[PDB]
Amino acid sequence: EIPKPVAPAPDILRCAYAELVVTDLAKSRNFYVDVLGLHVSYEDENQIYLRSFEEFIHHNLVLTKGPVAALKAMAFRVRTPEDVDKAEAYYQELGCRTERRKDGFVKGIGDALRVEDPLGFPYEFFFETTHVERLHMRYDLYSAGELVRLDHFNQVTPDVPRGRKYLEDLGFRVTEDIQDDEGTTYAAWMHRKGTVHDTALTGGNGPRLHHVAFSTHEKHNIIQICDKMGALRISDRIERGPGRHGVSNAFYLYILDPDNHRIEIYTQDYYTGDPDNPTITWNVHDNQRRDWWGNPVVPSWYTEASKVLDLDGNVQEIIERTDDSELEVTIGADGFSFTRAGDEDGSYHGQASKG
Amino acid sequence: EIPKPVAPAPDILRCAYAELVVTDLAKSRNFYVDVLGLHVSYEDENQIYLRSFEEFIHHNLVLTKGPVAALKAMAFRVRTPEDVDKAEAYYQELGCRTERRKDGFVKGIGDALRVEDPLGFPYEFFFETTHVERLHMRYDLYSAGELVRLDHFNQVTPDVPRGRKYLEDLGFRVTEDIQDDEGTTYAAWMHRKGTVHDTALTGGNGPRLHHVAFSTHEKHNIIQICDKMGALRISDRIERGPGRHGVSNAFYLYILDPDNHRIEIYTQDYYTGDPDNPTITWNVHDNQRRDWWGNPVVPSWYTEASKVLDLDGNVQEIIERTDDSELEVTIGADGFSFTRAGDEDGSYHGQASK
Amino acid sequence: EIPKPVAPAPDILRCAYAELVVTDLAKSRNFYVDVLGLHVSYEDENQIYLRSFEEFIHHNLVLTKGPVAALKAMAFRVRTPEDVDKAEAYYQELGCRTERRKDGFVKGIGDALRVEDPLGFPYEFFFETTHVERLHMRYDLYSAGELVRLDHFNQVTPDVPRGRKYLEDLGFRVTEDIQDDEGTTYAAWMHRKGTVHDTALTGGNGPRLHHVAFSTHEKHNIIQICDKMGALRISDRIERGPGRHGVSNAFYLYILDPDNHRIEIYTQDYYTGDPDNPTITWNVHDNQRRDWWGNPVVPSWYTEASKVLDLDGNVQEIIERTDDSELEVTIGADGFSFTRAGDEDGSYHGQASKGFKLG
Amino acid sequence: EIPKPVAPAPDILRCAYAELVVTDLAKSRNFYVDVLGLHVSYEDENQIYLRSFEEFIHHNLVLTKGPVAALKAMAFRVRTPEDVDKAEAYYQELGCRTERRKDGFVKGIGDALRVEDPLGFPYEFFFETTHVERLHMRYDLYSAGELVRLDHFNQVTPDVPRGRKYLEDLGFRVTEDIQDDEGTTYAAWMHRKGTVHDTALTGGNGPRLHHVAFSTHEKHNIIQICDKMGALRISDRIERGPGRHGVSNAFYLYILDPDNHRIEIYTQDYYTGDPDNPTITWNVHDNQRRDWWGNPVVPSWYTEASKVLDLDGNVQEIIERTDDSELEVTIGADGFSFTRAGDEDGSYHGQASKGFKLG
Numbered sequence A: 001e002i003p004k005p006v007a008p009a010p011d012i013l014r015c016a017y018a019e020l021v022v023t024d025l026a027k028s029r030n031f032y033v034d035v036l037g038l039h040v041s042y043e044d045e046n047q048i049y050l051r052s053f054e055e056f057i058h059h060n061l062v063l064t065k066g067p068v069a070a071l072k073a074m075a076f077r078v079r080t081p082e083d084v085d086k087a088e089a090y091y092q093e094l095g096c097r098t099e100r101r102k103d104g105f106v107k108g109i110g111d112a113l114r115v116e117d118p119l120g121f122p123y124e125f126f127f128e129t130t131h132v133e134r135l136h137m138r139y140d141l142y143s144a145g146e147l148v149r150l151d152h153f154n155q156v157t158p159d160v161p162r163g164r165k166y167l168e169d170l171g172f173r174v175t176e177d178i179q180d181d182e183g184t185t186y187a188a189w190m191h192r193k194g195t196v197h198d199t200a201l202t203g204g205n206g207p208r209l210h211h212v213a214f215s216t217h218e219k220h221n222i223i224q225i226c227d228k229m230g231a232l233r234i235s236d237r238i239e240r241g242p243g244r245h246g247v248s249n250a251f252y253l254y255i256l257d258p259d260n261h262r263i264e265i266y267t268q269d270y271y272t273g274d275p276d277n278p279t280i281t282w283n284v285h286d287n288q289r290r291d292w293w294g295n296p297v298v299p300s301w302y303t304e305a306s307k308v309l310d311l312d313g314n315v316q317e318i319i320e321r322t323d324d325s326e327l328e329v330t331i332g333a334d335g336f337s338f339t340r341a342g343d344e345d346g347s348y349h350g351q352a353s354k355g
Numbered sequence B: 001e002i003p004k005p006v007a008p009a010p011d012i013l014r015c016a017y018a019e020l021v022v023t024d025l026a027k028s029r030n031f032y033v034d035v036l037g038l039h040v041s042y043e044d045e046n047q048i049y050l051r052s053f054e055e056f057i058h059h060n061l062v063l064t065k066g067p068v069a070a071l072k073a074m075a076f077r078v079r080t081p082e083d084v085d086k087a088e089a090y091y092q093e094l095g096c097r098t099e100r101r102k103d104g105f106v107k108g109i110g111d112a113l114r115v116e117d118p119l120g121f122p123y124e125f126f127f128e129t130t131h132v133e134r135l136h137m138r139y140d141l142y143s144a145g146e147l148v149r150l151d152h153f154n155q156v157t158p159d160v161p162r163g164r165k166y167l168e169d170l171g172f173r174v175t176e177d178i179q180d181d182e183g184t185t186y187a188a189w190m191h192r193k194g195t196v197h198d199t200a201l202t203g204g205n206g207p208r209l210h211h212v213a214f215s216t217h218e219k220h221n222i223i224q225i226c227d228k229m230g231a232l233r234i235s236d237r238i239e240r241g242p243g244r245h246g247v248s249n250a251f252y253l254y255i256l257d258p259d260n261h262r263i264e265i266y267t268q269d270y271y272t273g274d275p276d277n278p279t280i281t282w283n284v285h286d287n288q289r290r291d292w293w294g295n296p297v298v299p300s301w302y303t304e305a306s307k308v309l310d311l312d313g314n315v316q317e318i319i320e321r322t323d324d325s326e327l328e329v330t331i332g333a334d335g336f337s338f339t340r341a342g343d344e345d346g347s348y349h350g351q352a353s354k
Numbered sequence C, D: 001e002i003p004k005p006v007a008p009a010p011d012i013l014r015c016a017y018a019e020l021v022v023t024d025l026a027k028s029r030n031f032y033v034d035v036l037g038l039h040v041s042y043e044d045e046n047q048i049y050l051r052s053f054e055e056f057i058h059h060n061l062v063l064t065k066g067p068v069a070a071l072k073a074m075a076f077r078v079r080t081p082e083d084v085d086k087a088e089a090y091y092q093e094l095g096c097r098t099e100r101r102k103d104g105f106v107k108g109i110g111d112a113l114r115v116e117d118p119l120g121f122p123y124e125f126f127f128e129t130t131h132v133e134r135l136h137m138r139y140d141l142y143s144a145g146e147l148v149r150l151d152h153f154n155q156v157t158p159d160v161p162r163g164r165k166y167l168e169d170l171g172f173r174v175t176e177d178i179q180d181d182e183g184t185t186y187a188a189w190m191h192r193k194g195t196v197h198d199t200a201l202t203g204g205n206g207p208r209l210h211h212v213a214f215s216t217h218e219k220h221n222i223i224q225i226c227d228k229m230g231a232l233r234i235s236d237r238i239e240r241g242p243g244r245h246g247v248s249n250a251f252y253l254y255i256l257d258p259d260n261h262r263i264e265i266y267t268q269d270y271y272t273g274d275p276d277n278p279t280i281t282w283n284v285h286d287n288q289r290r291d292w293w294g295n296p297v298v299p300s301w302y303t304e305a306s307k308v309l310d311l312d313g314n315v316q317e318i319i320e321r322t323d324d325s326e327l328e329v330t331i332g333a334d335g336f337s338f339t340r341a342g343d344e345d346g347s348y349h350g351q352a353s354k355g356f357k358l359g
């Protein structure tokens, strides 16, 4: 239903950075720099440019002061300068609004194309970026909870099949998804860079940004983030985890920034770069699909997500999902989940796992 | 009100083993050997004797086939052979029922005393044990989830101060506890060997055994146990965790065996050996006391625990706690907890966290 | 010196497997399966097919019984069936010997091309492969030392710039290298899959295969491999490490199989997938370039490597390196190394670091 | 031939702190605070008092500015105030020089006794100490290389059985030792607190202090210390390691402070608190006894150690070892070591393991 354009898709390398509008620049700086340990590439009174430990492009996160907290741009890096032209021609044919700046929208990025995509998300495509010192061996700066890479975005959208087809035509490959036996798709994960994903689609009212995810080297680094949050007595900002994912097989943690933007810390998924990488489909009632250890998913994780902006800086209107709700079918009043397929023992009726 | 005997206390070194009655020996073996990777010191059709990676005494766990799943004995090693005689005289003065077997109750233990202690728990005291190969450097046998030591027991009892004074007289020292402003004690941790505890008292209906705990080297070993349980599709047997404890500061996991005996896997508490080791008291309403990260404690963790047997092998009758319930005052309908004292942001009312 | 063909290079995805010839199959099986924990895809009296924990292709290593221990093939997977045709045309234009087998050289691989490449190495290109159970969440099988992926090969060749140009034309990008101030290149690392490398060139007499590398999830997994080797009283088979590499930033260990084939265990390098990824050049006299902690590199690491076979299965003749020797210029009698550039303190003259000399 | 006194031994709990004389207080501070991350309890122009992450007594390390770098005191905490009096009577009966200060020798310690012990070492015994904030849950301060406890001292002394007998009479129990088949003892480990050791005796010219050891929680913490030293371009101050010890089974690293005082970082030894804890004797030629992975012991580890002071602040005279040297019998020109006892394969004669000889 989103048609495949005749124009070639641009060659997208990876997710590269997010621009997030925040309301109190000092509080957010404290969260992202003081608590999480991200590295400042540039800052002034309006913006903070932050990067992970192993990054060499200018930034992975731009915090921009504004009146309404929201995603302003989710940016992917393309292979060549000519891929920014291809992106522009591709989104024109799709009838999408686009805006092209030879000198970039944020500091440290050159020629860039921003678009309101067919799902209502603000995508940016760019090649040119100002290189900075790669801190990958600066173990003199390395913190016990060090965030090493930007890994993915996760987007909330009402119709997952619709979005999936569009991203596949754009060159993303589905690695895992969640479905039921009645034809509904609840979520899908897709990649360009050869990890489990660069973005993911989560079925719900949208467009909204569910989260932005950063990686650590090891599982103990994620444990340390939790421990530090307890020491700072902000354990209430730990939403969910730590855990092992079923889908993706990664060790994880979800935390909430001062504007409630959700950040995931993630480590140790697997290689997906082969073009016939086997796709894995989970059943929506399988209680090990989201947390492998069967720990319950808190309802806020399903219902809460960040607003997104259009190209003019106004909030995108939210469209309701009419397909079945992952929350309702697993943990709501008429919900169901199993530990072992076909086994009544270890199954949950009308409530979440673990009592 | 448990009187201090004039007879000297036995010198207790550490918690050493538990004997657990199980209903299906083969299923239990599958859990303790095939899933958890404990090492077989002896087995036959009626019992399995198991030990941890770094142990040199005969065993840390005995699984005995019986009709009713229950704790049959929680055993402490004493410093000398004479300490068994001291234990006998001590418990006889307390008016407790005792039984002395010069050749032991279980294989690989020699002269031993079992008692029905004043809290109704079956304690064993012994010195003599058959030494076995210490597997501490057998990395050829080392599992990704390796259990390296027995760390502690945790006992459910209705009146914590009563039990705590009795254990102090036995030479245990309290390291941490949970209290409220009204003066109720909900739990206490106490030690002999210089870790946070060898046993602990949890307020509730008892005598019941809350859990037995084993230690791993590192946090990743606990993660692996969870991961393996997912792979075996037995994640419903993960009860609580993994987490960081507030009390003890240890990384932890609670799992349930086939008869619902609860096992804790535990690592990285701190040294308590100095006699003036500072005691830490947590408020019962502090949401970081049990899980430092503020994760909720599932009601089953407070309400479910194992039966204990008397010396004849019958189940000990339960006495109901009359002091306030930690479940009720934190997560029950009129309960509450906080992240930051005095702050309504991050506080939970009539409701658990997260 | 090696010309760029007019024919397009095949689109290479990644290193996929190696076929090693071994002299005693049962001894090699004990090393790779019982010691290292690799998973058996297939075996018989003549071959063992092994894979890592996260692999879905049929195998990452084939051990083949033969009279002379050697590398028989280093195989790269290509993106499409049509890329195998491209590889054939490309290598024919380079004037190399090639062999095409529609149903594969080894079990579990389909249409495959093997070539004697311009550096004398037996390369294989394939697309078609039998998928198997991907064991990535089989934590009921996971060992304390689990090998999760095949990561790279490392090749010994006498002229590194000559090979580097050829691999760049083939589509590999150099991520790191080691050079001196007098124009000599000692080593280069190059990738297709977006890690530090899929293969590497190490200057020395060749063609010889230096090692094959597998990855683990965490550093403690590499430690456990060492610990287990101690417990099995085969610590004499730990060649070098564990350590932190300067080049690649990975945590590492080198061990030796029963035929002296060198295996590296490797973890936690960085992403190189961007086309303008910064190339890092280390100076050969920098004592943190190979081991970041400054531990000395054992001389066998520089001198010993496995024979490689031609398409007929005969050993390839060795061509001697005439460029300067990394061993000689760093830890040899006229050698030099530094800890801090320009500082005499922490420098080493005619001997290795940490109080050692060449045996 | 150090007699057992009639007077009762003091009840020693554990090693508690060391007082090290250092020549440049600012440079030592950069090392212990900025590099290693210890926590400051008190400092001024003359001294810096440091503690580990889990400590509640005032300090584990006192750095005292002075003219000659040396160990000034190795302090053990005793169980009660009365035990300081027992210590005094005990050493007086041995005929040792003692000095008692009711208000301590350093800040944060109360009634204390220093003695010049029969091996020439300056020992302090105390009970009273100023309690400080226990930082064990201050994960807001926790570094990637955090030192969590003080674990042990290691002493160099010419006659190990003489020293061992004396420590046994003080209540220390031997856990492990190294010997040869002809009855020479090279080293012994002994404990009070239920870990492998609180102090250890290493055969050599002495009295000298070999090292002070701190523990970390996990192996990755020790790896981070190396990684950080590499980043700071002070890898030349990594003496030996990281490794796994044979004796003790601990993961370890040895580093050198600005005055060449050796610090060990140590983790994951085993419980020894039972009175019949099985002792383990290793053969001196076993190449897995010091490093379980067979990595060679750097010669400086055998030859270099810190001076110790007498109670007036003067350096103690050094007495030479007349028994065999561990260095000489294992890695010297006439030395040997084995991987498997009796097996020539994996054995080393006249040189160290892994292909190095002595520099």
Ligand SMILES: [Ca+2]
Residues within 6 Å of the ligand: C180, C181, C182
């Ligand atoms: Ca030069």
Ligand SMILES: [Cl-]
Residues within 6 Å of the ligand: A245, A289, A290, A291
């Ligand atoms: Cl999830």
Ligand SMILES: [Cl-]
Residues within 6 Å of the ligand: B245, B289, B290, B291
């Ligand atoms: Cl708890």
Ligand SMILES: [Cl-]
Residues within 6 Å of the ligand: C245, C289, C290, C291
């Ligand atoms: Cl290297």
Ligand SMILES: [Cl-]
Residues within 6 Å of the ligand: D245, D289, D290, D291
């Ligand atoms: Cl050693």
Ligand SMILES: [Fe+2]
Residues within 6 Å of the ligand: A152, A154, A211, A213, A264
């Ligand atoms: Fe995610």
Ligand SMILES: [Fe+2]
Residues within 6 Å of the ligand: B152, B153, B154, B211, B213, B264
């Ligand atoms: Fe416990």
Ligand SMILES: [Fe+2]
Residues within 6 Å of the ligand: C152, C153, C154, C211, C213, C264
């Ligand atoms: Fe390599």
Ligand SMILES: [Fe+2]
Residues within 6 Å of the ligand: D152, D153, D154, D211, D213, D264
């Ligand atoms: Fe030591």
